[PDB]
Design a protein around this ligand. Structure first.
Ligand code: NA
Ligand code: NA
Ligand code: NA
Ligand code: NA
Lengths: 74, 86
């Protein structure tokens, strides 16, 4: 009857609600995996930046020693 | 009787309603998945763009350092050869 027919509507509306919810949980996880993969690659490059800065600073110190020696030599 | 015939027509209308509802809800769900797939593709594309930019920036930074070191070593070896007294 009328209540069973209304319940049938609600069961279908609840079905789609849950279906969209499970689909959303898969997309959220795929985005999570995606963010972790690129966060990993970003950390590596941020360590490369600091090593490069440290190398630049070391070369600058060698150039100071060399120029000071040239001035003090003759 | 007249109530059974009324209920039978209501039952018929309900059967047709569930058919249309399910069909239309399926169309909305397909467009919803189509939007989520495009959002995920955009996210990967943005992260790969950022990674390529930083990768090309690091290559430039390494090249500039390598150039400065190469010219410093060349000038130091030139100096040394010029300081040979004998
Ligand atoms: Na279903
Ligand atoms: Na860094
Ligand atoms: Na979209
Ligand atoms: Na000599």
């Amino acid at each position: 009857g009328s209540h069973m027919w209304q319940r049938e509507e609600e069961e279908l509306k609840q079905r789609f609600m849950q279906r969209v919810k499970e689909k959303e949980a898969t997309f959220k996880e795929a985005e999570k995996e995606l963010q972790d993969k690129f966060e990993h690659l970003k950390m590596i490059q941020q360590e490369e930046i600091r090593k490069l800065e440290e190398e630049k600073k070391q070369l600058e110190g060698e150039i100071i020693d060399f120029y000071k020696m040239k001035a003090a030599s003759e | 009787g007249s109530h059974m015939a009324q209920m039978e027509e209501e039952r018929r209308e309900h059967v047709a309603k569930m058919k249309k509802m399910e069909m239309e809800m399926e169309q909305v769900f397909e467009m919803k998945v189509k939007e989520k797939v495009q959002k995920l593709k955009d996210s990967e594309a943005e992260l790969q763009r950022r990674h390529e930019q930083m990768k090309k920036n690091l290559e430039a930074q390494h090249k500039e350092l390598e150039e400065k070191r190469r010219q410093f070593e060349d000038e130091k070896a030139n100096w040394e050869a010029q300081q040979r007294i004998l």
